[PDB]
Amino acid sequence: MYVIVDIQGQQMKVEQGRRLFVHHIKDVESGASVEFDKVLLVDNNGAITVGSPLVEGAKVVCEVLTPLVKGDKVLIFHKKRRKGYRKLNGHRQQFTEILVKEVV
Amino acid sequence: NLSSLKPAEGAVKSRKRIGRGPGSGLGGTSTRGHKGAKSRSGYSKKIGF
Amino acid sequence: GARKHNSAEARKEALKQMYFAKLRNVPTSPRKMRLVADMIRGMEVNRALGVLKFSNKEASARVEKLLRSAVANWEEKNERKAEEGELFVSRICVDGASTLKRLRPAPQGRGYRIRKRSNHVTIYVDT
Amino acid sequence: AHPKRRQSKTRTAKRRTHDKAVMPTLAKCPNCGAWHIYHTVCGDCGYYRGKLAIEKE
Amino acid sequence: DTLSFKTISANKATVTKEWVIVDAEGQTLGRMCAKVAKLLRGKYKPNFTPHVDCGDNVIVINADKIVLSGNKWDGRIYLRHTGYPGGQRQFTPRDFMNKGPEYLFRKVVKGMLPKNRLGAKIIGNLYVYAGTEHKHEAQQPRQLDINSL
Amino acid sequence: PRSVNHVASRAKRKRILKLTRGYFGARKNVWTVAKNTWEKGLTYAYRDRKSKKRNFRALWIQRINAAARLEGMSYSRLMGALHANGIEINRKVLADLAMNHPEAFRAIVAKVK
RNA sequence: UACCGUGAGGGAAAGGUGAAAAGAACCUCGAAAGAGGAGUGCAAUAGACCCUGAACCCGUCUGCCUACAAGCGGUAGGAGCGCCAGGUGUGACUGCGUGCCUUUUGCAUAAUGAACCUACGAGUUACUGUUUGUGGCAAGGUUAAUUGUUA
RNA sequence: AUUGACCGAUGGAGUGAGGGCAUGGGUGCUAAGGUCCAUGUCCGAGAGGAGAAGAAUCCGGACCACCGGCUAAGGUCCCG
RNA sequence: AUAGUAUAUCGGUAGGGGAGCAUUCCAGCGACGUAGAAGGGAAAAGGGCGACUUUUUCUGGAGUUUCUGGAAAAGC
Ligand SMILES: [K+]
Ligand SMILES: [K+]
Ligand SMILES: [K+]
Ligand SMILES: [K+]
Ligand SMILES: [Mg+2]
Ligand SMILES: [Mg+2]
Ligand SMILES: [Mg+2]
Ligand SMILES: [Mg+2]
Ligand SMILES: [Mg+2]
Ligand SMILES: [Mg+2]
Ligand SMILES: [Mg+2]
Ligand SMILES: [Mg+2]
Ligand SMILES: [Mg+2]
Ligand SMILES: [Mg+2]
Ligand SMILES: [Mg+2]
Ligand SMILES: [Mg+2]
Ligand SMILES: [Mg+2]
Ligand SMILES: [Mg+2]
Ligand SMILES: [Mg+2]
Ligand SMILES: [Mg+2]
Ligand SMILES: [Mg+2]
Ligand SMILES: [Mg+2]
Ligand SMILES: [Mg+2]
Ligand SMILES: [Mg+2]
Ligand SMILES: [Mg+2]
Ligand SMILES: [Mg+2]
Ligand SMILES: [Mg+2]
Ligand SMILES: [Mg+2]
Ligand SMILES: [Mg+2]
Ligand SMILES: [Mg+2]
Ligand SMILES: [Mg+2]
Ligand SMILES: [Mg+2]
Ligand SMILES: [Mg+2]
Ligand SMILES: [Mg+2]
Ligand SMILES: [Mg+2]
Ligand code: NA
Ligand code: NA
Ligand code: NA
Ligand SMILES: [Zn+2]
């Protein structure tokens, strides 16, 4: 089976043992568990359950792997030609690595 | 104790340095505006004028 | 402290398997010399000697005598006279050497610079 | 009259596509076995077309 | 650090590329060509990828019976230039029909296609015939009612 | 004392010239040409990060349009039926379902049709 | 000093082998220039223009791409192929995109400016005021020239 | 009612070549991408979207990231 | 920025204000180096953000440097 669930404002396909990268979760340590009860569609080999608001009974439980994973560095450049204005900053996005255990 | 000297907070300050690039906010025209008498080297105010 | 001695020992052991000859500071322009190097690149040595001997370019006579040296270096490092049809030019390159600057007068008192260029030539041979 | 711009490396090298040294037209001498230019007298032996032409001392 | 859920692009080894035969027996020229262009582009494929050739090869038959409305056959002026001074020339849709259907359809379908290298390739996937007779039975062309599009 | 930052001044140039590898001609290695080209490229990237979200939503909608039309429904009517029924599946998920799992997409259509 | 000027006069560039010359006997190819060896030496890719040895600029080789294709040359996507377990080189095809500086009401501007690289290059110091951040002493605060002791 | 937007003292400035549009006018020919004033506004010093491509017309004020969603002006045959 | 995490705010030329990095040398407490310093080539990784920093390996063959404070021939 696979499911679509809204984890941290993002809808993802989830299967048992996937190691998904999601937006950074605050106040977690490696090995902690997290629940996600926002299943929109369930597709277990032939029969589809479409959630109107939600599937209402489906959820996924994940084991946190890495509390803090940093995305690649992106250079943010602003410039207005012939005016002298110029600035350059660096950005890294923050993620959390989770391993899906059960698709209950 | 010559290895750990410290002055009082807010007692020393760095000096202004102009004409050294855009990021400082003091480069290019170096706080002088664009043209006219006041922008030139050697301008001084005529006190009574 | 023996580091540069150990770096240099490996450099010398590899040179025993490389057969080559060099021409340094030839007083002619590198671009014209390159025209000759493209002609004999990757060509059997016996055929290249005749090609260089009857070439209409003046740079060929210098190169012909350097190929003869490269073959002789091969036989010294291999301990036998080379066969016929055996060796060939496996590598050749021309590099610009140091320039001699001169003056040539021009009208109305002006003077221009003349460059008298030089080049280096290196040839490798292989069986 | 004047170049508006310097030529790039690519443009200069593209023009030089047709700058080639001409190879000699060589033949082997049936007498000497040496290379000589076709339709000329062999400078080594002096022969030409099977006959002696320049008896060299 | 990376993207887990990602959108997949079709490539040369994953596209469908079917053969279809359509019928121009009584269709308006520009309205039928607007649909043929969608077919060649792959706008009807759920795996549509804009940088790859994913559409269907199209065969048009009975193209000599296309219909143009109004006073368009000898009222619509085309313009072109030879490149010589005083070199502008005029021609009409009927002037193309004399050459053949494949010379009017190709011009009309072109101009409804992307103006790039990919569009130049996919116009070659169109084959236009006057009569009902063609030779592609080795490709097993499928039948499609253009009115169903 | 006399202060000249030879090594530091030259290191700033060398770091940027690693970023201009792969450019055409003098734009890859000549300092004032290359730095000009690199700075212009950074302005494109800020604008193109935004346009990425526009281009990918347009591609999701096009694929959804083709899949819906194979089931007798246009994109505008299918979307109107989903929003009427409270279904909150986003366009990225639906397009993926349209392309790679056509049987699940057909169940969403059969729920609102 | 060289060099320039009739003359008064003007006026450069140019440091570094190695601890020690031990500064390369002798052989090979060459008419000999040059090299390949040998030998000295910690090191000769320290070989005389010799410590280190960057850029612009110039070659050879290897990998990928390129002869139906049209614009500031990148940027965001994206197959295939080649190397070393998901990193790296390349980039078929697609979207968007008229350099930079200065001066201007306003510049892709056919307004100014630069061949390129390396190096050089432009708000500094003294004194006298004034405002302010931080301190000492406080109805008082502070010495100037100079003098004594020591060194 | 109002994120506080006003004033005094005192340290530091820049500016004193403006421009388009709408409205009320003078001048001009009820000409000018003209010129001179007044009231707003925008460009100047402002990116994004529509208008094929346009400094100031229409929508809209960019802290950074996102392969999420709703809309504005304007649109929904194809290029799009 | 205000209140002590909450509310607001964060497009910018002339121009005003705040906080930092690198460079040369000095004082102090201390470290590193022929078992390989500085410099030069390559690669990898870091930083509320950045000016920049760190590590590995090749070359190189003798000097170099952390922190706190101080002074400028202090950045194209
Ligand atoms: K070198
Ligand atoms: K081609
Ligand atoms: K001019
Ligand atoms: K030093
Ligand atoms: Mg400013
Ligand atoms: Mg400037
Ligand atoms: Mg100026
Ligand atoms: Mg002025
Ligand atoms: Mg002024
Ligand atoms: Mg003066
Ligand atoms: Mg010469
Ligand atoms: Mg000759
Ligand atoms: Mg004369
Ligand atoms: Mg030529
Ligand atoms: Mg060395
Ligand atoms: Mg040296
Ligand atoms: Mg063609
Ligand atoms: Mg003007
Ligand atoms: Mg101005
Ligand atoms: Mg413009
Ligand atoms: Mg031009
Ligand atoms: Mg001027
Ligand atoms: Mg010029
Ligand atoms: Mg110009
Ligand atoms: Mg320049
Ligand atoms: Mg210059
Ligand atoms: Mg005035
Ligand atoms: Mg005025
Ligand atoms: Mg006017
Ligand atoms: Mg008027
Ligand atoms: Mg005027
Ligand atoms: Mg404004
Ligand atoms: Mg804002
Ligand atoms: Mg701001
Ligand atoms: Mg300086
Ligand atoms: Na300025
Ligand atoms: Na080493
Ligand atoms: Na410099
Ligand atoms: Zn003969």
- For every residue of D25-55, DSSP letters joined together read -EEE-TTT--EEETTS--TTT-EETTEE-S-
CB C92 within 8 A of CB C5: no
Q: Which residue is nearest to nucleotide G123 (CA to C1')?
A: B18
Residue A39: strand pairing partners: A5
Which residue does chain E place closest to F100, by CA atoms?
A: E47
The SS3 of residue C52 is: helix
Choose among C90, C115, C118, C92: nearest CA to C25: C118
| CB pair distance less than 8 Å for A84 and B23 | no
List all nucleotides in chain H with at least one atom under 7 A from a protein Cβ.
13-16, 45-46, 48, 64-70, 76-80
Query: Which of A13, A46, A52 shows the shortest C-beta gap to F87?
Result: A52
d(CA F113, CA F109): 6
Dmax (CA) of chain B: 56
Choose among F60, F68, F62: nearest CA to F96: F60
Instruction: Give F100's contacts (C-beta < 8 A, 6+ positions apart).
Output: E8
The SS3 of residue C108 is: helix
d(CA B5, CA A69): 41
Query: Which of F42, F46, F89 shows the shortest C-beta gap to A41?
Result: F89
Other C-beta atoms closer than 10 Å to the C-beta of B26 total 15
Q: Could you please report the per-residue DSSP string of D14-28? A: HHGGG--PPPP-EEE
Instruction: Retrieve residue C103's tokens.
Output: 């003056």
Question: Which of A7, A11, A73 to probe by mutation at the F interface, max F CB count within 10 Å?
Answer: A11
Which residue does chain A place closest to F41, by CA atoms?
A: A77
d(CA E110, CA E37): 8
- Residue E130 CA, ligand 5 centroid: distance in Å: 73
Count, residues in chain C: 127
Q: Could you please report the per-residue DSSP string of E106-132? A: HHHHTTSS-SSHHHHHHGGGEEE-SSS
Instruction: Retrieve residue C30's tokens.
Output: 């590198």
CB F46 within 8 A of CB A76: yes
d(CA D44, CA D56): 9
d(CA F10, CA F33): 16
The torsion angles phi and psi of D19, rounded to 5 degrees, stand at: -120, 90
F99 interfacial to chain E (CB closer than 8 Å): yes
| Neighbours, chain F (3 or more CB pairs < 8 A) | A, D, E
Choose among A6, D15, C29: nearest CA to F88: A6
Residue C93: strand pairing partners: C122
E6 interfacial to chain A (CB closer than 8 Å): no
CB E5 within 8 A of CB A7: no
A95 interfacial to chain E (CB closer than 8 Å): yes
Sign of CA dihedral C85, C86, C90, C94: negative
CB E24 within 8 A of CB E60: yes
The SS3 of residue E61 is: strand
Contacts of A71 in chain E (CB under 8 A): 1-2
- Residue E27 CA, ligand 17 centroid: distance in Å: 28
Residue C96: strand pairing partners: C119
d(CA A99, CA A102): 10
Q: Gap from E77 CA to G59 C1', in Å? A: 60
CB E19 within 8 A of CB E136: yes
Burial B32-49 (b: 16+ CB within 10 A, else e): eeeeeeeeeeeeeeeeee
Which helix (H) or strand (E) covers residue C112, if one does? strand C111-116
Work out the minimum CA distance from E3 to partner chain A, whole angstroms.
Answer: 7
| CB pair distance less than 8 Å for F42 and A88 | yes
CB B7 within 8 A of CB B1: no
Other C-beta atoms closer than 10 Å to the C-beta of F3 total 4
Residue written as token pair 């590198």? C30
The SS3 of residue C118 is: coil
Instruction: Give F66's contacts (C-beta < 8 A, 6+ positions apart).
Output: E43, E44, E45, E46, E48, F98
Instruction: Give F86's contacts (C-beta < 8 A, 6+ positions apart).
Output: A52, A53
**Residue numbers 1-49 of B with CB closer than 7 A to any atom of strand I:** 2-7, 12-17, 20-21, 24-26, 28-34
In angstroms, this model's resolution equals 2.6
Which parts of A1-104 fold into alpha helices (H)? none
> CA dist F89 to A3, A6, A103, F95, Å?
12, 10, 19, 10
Q: DSSP state, C95? A: E
Q: DSSP state, B37? A: G
How would you classify the pairing of strands E126-128 and E57-61? parallel
Long-range own/partner contacts, residues C75-84 (CB < 8 A, 24 or more apart): C77/C16, C77/C17, C77/C19, C78/C19, C84/C46
The SS3 of residue F90 is: coil
The SS3 of residue E90 is: strand
Residue written as token pair 């409804």? E112
Contacts of F25 in chain D (CB under 8 A): 8-10
Burial of F28 (0-12, 13-18, 19+ CB in 10 A): middle
Residue written as token pair 């619509």? E76
Query: Which of C36, C39, C51 shows the shortest C-beta gap to D26?
Result: C51
On the CB side of B6, CA atoms within 13 Å amount to 4
